[PDB]
């Protein structure tokens, strides 16, 4: 009948008290529950926190088994997928405040379904989507102090973040200016774990806490209230950039704020920010790539599955603009996981009526669309074939900005 909230603020006990006792009488009542998780590591979680009851853990490829624990990703994939899908009564979601692209698919889904009588669910979340308050209440005071935040190194000055003594947690704009921060604070005697994707130390600087940072006691957050987020150009023919680090949602700044001040007993914890916070998210990749994936979810009656409504103002197709029909879904659904791309991307390339095996694309493109390796166009030699320099149809900054993720684009565009 209702999608439920629990405002559940920061404090490890949530998987530790409430799930069990919230799937415990799941259970009894009969009902066909769906766990999601946004993470492994919290997907893994949930398994330690689990122990003795009826449980199907799954990633996923009448008896007794009624309950299934699985990642935001694994639902969205199945649905999308020709295969069968349980028809779940129940959906509860851990950390529903995730903008992963289907994570906010797999919330409208089961939105859609609440609005449609066929279920019932639980979002359990600290900082619900809807929500901007960045400095929300929680077990022990914080001390909230907006002073000047170094974007790199720095010889003098800031006295304040070595002289402090205790652990510290620095959220900075990108992954490079990461690895300058660190540097410097090393250089400085100071500890530091640097983590993108032991024990005693003094520093953790994290691009984001989607990775790692799972029961960590600190002191101190420093937050830059900045991050890098991948962006759509609408003029062209679609592009996606990997532009510089903008200001953060407060709902996101919130977040952060919450790995500090959530045991009783340290009441002089703190929170450094420099830089406001900003709502327009619109232009984000992931609200697109989002919508492209309930679209291509099928549905009872033939409906659309509508986002869940807070997050409705960020989409401007109606629905059913990027339906894909036929072989297409297929080609899609094979460059998602097998190719392992972006899903702006895969649809790109699926729509326009390309093939899985068609690697052409990456190639026949304008002038301007030359990945640059230094600042040098790349070669890629393929099956015994050419020497072609890499010029993709569509550019989508996600596939070669990160140098790891080069290597498997020209793995990918090689064969």
Known sequence: ????????????????????????????????????????????????????????????????????????????????????????????????????????????????????????????????????????????????????????????????????????????????????????????????IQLNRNDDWDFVVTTDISEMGANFKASRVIDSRKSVKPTIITEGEGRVILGEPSAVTAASAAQRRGRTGRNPSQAGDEYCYGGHTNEDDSNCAHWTEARIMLDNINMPNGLIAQFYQPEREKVYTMDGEYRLRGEERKNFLELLRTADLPVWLAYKVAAAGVSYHDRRWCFDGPRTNTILEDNNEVEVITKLGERKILRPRWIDARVYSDHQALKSFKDFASG
């Open 1 to 192: 009948k209702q999608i439920t909230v629990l405002d559940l603020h920061p404090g490890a006990g949530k998987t530790r008290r409430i799930l069990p006792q919230i799937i415990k009488e799941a259970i009894n009542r009969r009902l066909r529950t769906a766990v999601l998780a946004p993470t492994r590591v919290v997907a893994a979680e949930m398994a330690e926190a689990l122990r003795g009851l009826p449980i199907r853990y799954q990633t996923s490829a009448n008896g007794n088994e009624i309950v299934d624990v699985m990642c935001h990703a694994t639902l969205t994939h199945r649905l999308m997928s020709p295969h069968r899908v349980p028809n779940y009564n129940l959906f509860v979601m851990d950390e529903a405040h995730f903008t992963d692209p289907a994570s906010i698919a797999a919330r409208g889904y089961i939105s859609t379904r609440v609005e449609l009588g066929e279920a019932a669910a639980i979002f359990m979340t600290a900082t619900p989507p809807g929500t901007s308050d960045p400095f929300p209440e929680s077990n022990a005071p914080i001390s909230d102090l907006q002073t000047e935040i170094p974007d790199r190194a720095w010889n003098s000055g800031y006295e304040w973040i070595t002289e402090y003594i205790g652990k510290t947690v620095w959220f900075v704009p990108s992954v490079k200016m990461g690895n300058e921060i660190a540097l410097c604070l090393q250089r400085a005697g100071k500890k530091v």
